[PDB]
Nucleic acid binder design. Structure first.
Ligand SMILES: O=c1ccn([C@@H]2O[C@H](COP(=O)(O)O[C@H]3[C@@H](O)CO[C@@H]3CO)[C@@H](OP(=O)(O)O)[C@H]2O)c(=O)[nH]1
Ligand SMILES: Nc1ncnc2c1ncn2[C@@H]1O[C@H](COP(=O)(O)OP(=O)(O)CP(=O)(O)O)[C@@H](O)[C@H]1O
Ligand SMILES: Nc1ncnc2c1ncn2[C@@H]1O[C@H](COP(=O)(O)OP(=O)(O)CP(=O)(O)O)[C@@H](O)[C@H]1O
Ligand SMILES: [Mg+2]
Ligand SMILES: [Mg+2]
Ligand SMILES: [Mg+2]
Ligand SMILES: [Mg+2]
Lengths: 673, 674
RNA sequence: AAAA
RNA sequence: AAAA
């Protein structure tokens, strides 16, 4: 702790405490974990020579580097202390030493505008024109290679730059590994406070105006993008500036000037003889209602895809063609023609997010809905059953959230035999909600048919998260999603014939009793009454008979009927005691099943046992045996029975669920599909 | 019709005269904006051309698509003569376009002094707030005034005239709650922001009105790094110096973060609270000793990763200071490096508070373009690594995708049925299929180091910096397919054979390297797709290679259960389908009864000594044998052991034989579900 | 806020 | 280019 006290004592420049701690035995060379900072590094950074000397006399290593490889000597240049630079040079520092990114003391003096340090270092033999040597990894990225002059230019240090050029023989035209020279660096200054003076100085010393920065940006183009008439004027006074250069977007200085509505700059470019054959110049000026610029351009000789979506697409084709100003990566138009729906904070609109067609949900940037929607979407990219989040753009207090463009909602789809659609839609939604809860850590709170979106596939996707809640642990929030999911099950099974709102209006038990079949009834009940194992609820329910095809249900009935213990009614057999009813279970459809079957097929099946008289009896096992046996020889009866899967399910609607419930947690699970 | 508009746009009076006198439509509206020849003439401020169009019957008040009238356009152009002309033609001085813009507002927007003065004297309502469409209003658009327009557009003379001569309300607010002062500080034209700000304050503008992120004028001025604006705002009596934006940041904290020493010191001198955040530590990080001392003298104060492999490093990265690059927080450094790369490396990162892998590129590069264009186009492909986003900084491009634990190659470096091989190859097949057919690209670099493994352990396709459009070249698809075939062999061999020499040997050599018939047949089909190239990977997902041993065993039992097989029917479809013939070479099951245990064999024949016939060496009988034995064992286990393994071991060519024979018949119903 |  |  005394070690951490030492560093704090130094940081607060408390000489007495530092003395006290050192004389008490504190580790004078202690390095803090992430950074490798020592008391000495801190003392130099505070520019406190007295504290520095105190530390050295207590045994501080004078050249011990921190994690980025910086020495106390180099830090002394950053602080601008000639006294400290002198001291460390007498303690073994080398004037041209560098950190692990290649920064020397001289460069740092230039970076920080430290004139006296800079002069002192020069006179102690600092190499003025060293280009930074950095790590191999950085070098592949074209990092490294910068010089003190570039540093002075980029940081806007006019006096340092003058001294470098006139007194220290700095190479004005050196380039970094990105190909940038001092002039480019100056025009990349975030501190526009001295850019003009800097630019004048560099140009007068023979700086090359025809050099490129990152995105193909020339000095002239950067000056135009700074909207700086003075910079542009000075650059155009160069005798051999290449006025028609284009950036990485193929844009000239003139085109950019017109696009940025810089009339005076544009006119100057034209008068200097910039080509007007470089884009839609006149149309752009016209679009910006600049009649004066339109005339200037003309008097200087200026001239004059397939959508994925079916439902949208006619509109998307129009949106793809029309002019629209970009908002970051998003091209769209808040207009009735491109509106998908009305919304509390605007609407849903067609858009292109990275040339990709998307739906755009608008928000007031600060709003509770905005942060709920965006927080969930940012955290749920790995969830495949959610609508996929492309990205978001903020503009002027507005937030535009971009998301997979879908054809229609589940509700609209339903407004347009085995119901396979219900099965795989609910399956996708179950998986969506599950991943949301367990992986994403959110609940939805607004599970309803309008928020289920249908692909052109037609695959379903969960959407609308502006009422979602981050999960802290309150089981009531999960329960709400589950009981909306239960109502969603019934909504889909009923094919939208019952609105979702009056399903919400009625109780759980009323929703359950509204179920048209035992599978949906049992599934919904389980959603409404999950165990203590709420976490595994949706996982388990994906294996519920509701999701079994009619062929699969029929197959498992036959599979269980094929158990030899069933085929030969073994008394105390495990499967038979498992399948037995009990007080007080039943008004079951199959309590006297042999009487429910056709007379002809039943007597024909019983014929197989007439020698010993082991006829079928009204036990659940014999019924399963009956189903297994009938299934086998059926490959006359086929007409009298019809679809065998459909037949047994129709006359015994509670059988499948009964078998599942009975064998759900035993080794006989193996018979399930 | 088009020639007339063009004639007007070129101010060619004579040509306009000729076209009009020649019977051109004078009220033609172009498709994009509903522009007429008259709208253009007014925009060009050509009263002579306007008068010409009117005398040929141009509707003087016909609006374009956004609702703007010629009268409103005249204000934009700044033409008093045209404004006067249209008022005499039925224009109302306070009329507006569909977004609420009046002629007066437009004069203010465009800084047209003479137009503005004329309109005011003709009764323009100076203090109207824009009424816009219902949809825009729900977004809190609308509500702006001419004064806000002048302020935002930097029109100083217009602003003074509005304030001093026209009774403009200095403190009106738009629907976002912004006043003129806020609008002034949103000018993209900092040439006049000081004068505008000074003038508004002198007329009693409210300094404490919020902008669009909890931003006060003070905070906005600090963010402009503008000392003059900051000085002037601090001179206002009821300035709220301690207000925080929606990030909870004060003007002082932002000043320190932005390394604005003079501004920060001024704020401190004006009495700003120094309990704002890590003020001092931020100043230290920026090596500003003088700022540290100023702060101190004014009394300043002195989560779980998902990844296992990465995790410790992610915890460190989460904790340390790092400057943000847009939505990305990362550190190009060995400690956080995943791999070396041609244009930098792969690194740990947080893209929107989410852990990701970051691939670095030189921003212009061919590799960068190929990687990013593929990723942007493939977001709906669930089997690819998921694209979070990209950041472009200073000629560098940083591409963020899901962070995976390890590669396929690393994973497999670390009797049994190879469950892993089927599951990884299934995912990769679906990945490639979607890339080709949905995303419309070819990968071109299918190899084990580009298959990434989840914590699940699910497989994902990555690395797209060599991907191609795709434009129609079958050869491009072919290359992916034969890389895929080699990937199959590579995985089945558990990585014991390097992928590079797999690539070095021919297709026939790779096929012949297969250790079992299922991989052999699957690889051959990848190397030799038919006319159905597009459905190749989709069809092959149903190949026996992807059937579990249980499922292979089951289909055999299913086929063996056919009645025609049990009752060796004279002319049955299934028996003739299963029948070999010329010149099918010697299968392992040709004399199968001799290959059985064969104490098991006599026990099996025991079922047919009273009724029926003993097993013969036909394929049908072997399938019946398999079906029967399955039934018996379910009711022998010690002799056979695992039955699926048993039949596959002694008859390795049986499963593929049955599949090939029955593939395009109704008997495919006996196959597994997927 | 808004044109081939 | 780079500290708790
Ligand atoms: O190793 C074995 C061999 C056979 N069996 C069963 O013994 C019965 C004989 O059938 P098979 O002789 O093979 O054939 C029948 C018809 O299938 C068509 O021709 C014949 C009739 O004329 C069938 O049982 P069950 O019919 O379900 O009672 C078979 O499963 C075993 O259990 N284990
Ligand atoms: N990605 C998309 N593709 C197609 N249609 C979409 C869509 N996203 C939303 N929609 C449509 O717009 C409707 C509304 O979108 P959304 O559900 O996200 O807003 P919302 O319900 O939260 C607004 P409010 O609460 O005020 O009613 C959806 O029900 C759907 O009809
Ligand atoms: N999302 C991710 N998660 C974990 N590791 C990843 C990863 N993305 C890439 N890697 C690792 O980094 C290695 C290289 O990444 P990547 O394949 O994308 O670059 P690359 O092969 O195109 C560069 P080069 O051509 O120079 O060899 C990968 O093989 C893998 O080991
Ligand atoms: Mg909704
Ligand atoms: Mg909602
Ligand atoms: Mg790779
Ligand atoms: Mg690559």
């Amino acid at each position: 702790e005394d070690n951490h006290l030492l560093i704090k004592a130094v940081q607060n420049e408390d000489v007495d405490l530092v003395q006290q701690l050192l004389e008490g035995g504190a580790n004078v060379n202690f390095q803090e974990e992430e950074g490798g900072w020592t008391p000495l590094h801190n003392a130099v950074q505070m520019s406190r020579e007295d504290i520095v000397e105190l530390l050295l006399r207590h045994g501080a290593d004078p050249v011990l580097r921190k994690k980025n490889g910086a020495t106390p000597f180099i830090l002394a240049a950053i602080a601008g202390s000639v006294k400290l630079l002198k001291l460390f040079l007498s303690k073994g520092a080398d004037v041209n030493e560098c950190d692990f990114y290649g920064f020397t003391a001289f460069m740092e003096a230039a970076v920080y505008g430290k004139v006296k340090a800079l002069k002192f270092l020069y006179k102690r033999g600092a190499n003025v024109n060293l280009r930074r040597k950095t790590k191999e990894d950085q070098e592949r990225l074209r990092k490294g290679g910068a010089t003190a002059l570039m540093d002075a230019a980029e940081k806007g240090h006019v006096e340092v730059l003058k001294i470098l050029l006139d007194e220290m023989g700095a190479d004005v035209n050196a380039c970094d590994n990105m190909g940038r020279n001092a002039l480019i660096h100056a025009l990349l200054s975030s501190d526009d406070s001295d850019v003009e003076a800097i630019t004048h100085l560099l140009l007068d010393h023979g700086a090359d105006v025809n050099v490129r920065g990152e995105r193909g940006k020339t000095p002239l183009i950067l000056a135009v993008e700074k909207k700086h008439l003075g910079l542009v004027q000075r650059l155009l006074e160069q005798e051999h500036i290449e006025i028609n250069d284009t950036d990485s977007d193929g844009k000239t200085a003139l085109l950019l000037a017109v696009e940025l509505k810089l009339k005076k700059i544009a006119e100057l470019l034209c008068k200097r003889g910039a080509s007007t054959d470089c884009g839609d110049l006149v149309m752009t000026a016209r679009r910006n209602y600049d009649h004066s610029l339109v005339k200037v351009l003309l008097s200087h000789g200026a001239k004059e895809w397939k959508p994925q979506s079916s439902h949208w697409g006619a509109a998307l084709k129009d949106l793809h063609r029309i002019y629209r100003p970009m908002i970051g990566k998003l091209k769209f138009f808040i207009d009735e023609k491109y509106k998908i729906a009305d919304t509390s904070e605007g609407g849903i609109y067609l858009g292109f997010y990275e040339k990709q067609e998307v739906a755009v949900k608008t928000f007031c940037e600060g709003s509770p809905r905005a942060q709920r929607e965006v927080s969930c979407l940012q955290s749920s990219r790995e969830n495949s059953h959610l609508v996929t989040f492309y990205g978001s753009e903020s503009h002027r207090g507005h937030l535009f959230v971009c998301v997979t463009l879908c054809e229609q909602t589940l509700e609209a789809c339903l407004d347009v035999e085995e119901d396979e659609f219900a099965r795989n839609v609910l399956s996708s939604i179950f998986k969506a909600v599950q991943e949301l809860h367990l992986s994403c850590g959110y609940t939805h709170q607004d599970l309803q048919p309008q928020n289920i979106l249908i692909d052109s596939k037609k695959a379903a996707h969960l959407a609308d998260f502006d009422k979602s809640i981050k999960w802290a642990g309150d089981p009531q929030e999960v329960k709400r999603d589950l009981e909306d999911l239960g109502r969603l099950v019934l909504y889909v099974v009923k094919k939208g014939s019952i609105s979702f709102e009056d399903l919400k209006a009625q109780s759980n038990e009323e929703v359950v009793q509204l179920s048209p079949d035992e599978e949906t009834k049992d599934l919904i009940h389980r959603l409404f009454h999950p165990g203590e194992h709420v976490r595994d609820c949706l996982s388990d329910l994906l294996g519920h008979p509701f999701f079994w095809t009619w062929e699969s249900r029929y197959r498992t009935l036959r599979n269980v009927g094929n158990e030899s213990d069933i085929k030969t009614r073994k008394s105390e057999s495990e499967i038979l005691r498992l399948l037995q009813p009990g007080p007080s279970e039943h008004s079951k459809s199959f309590d006297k099943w042999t009487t429910k079957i056709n007379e002809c097929v039943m007597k024909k099946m019983n014929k197989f046992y007439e020698k010993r008289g082991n006829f079928y009896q009204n036990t659940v096992g014999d019924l399963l045996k009956f189903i297994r046996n009938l299934g086998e020889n059926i490959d006359k009866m086929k007409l009298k029975i019809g679809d065998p899967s459909l037949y047994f399910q129709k006359t015994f609607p509670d059988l499948v669920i009964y078998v599942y419930t009975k064998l759900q947690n035993t080794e006989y699970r193996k018979h399930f599909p």
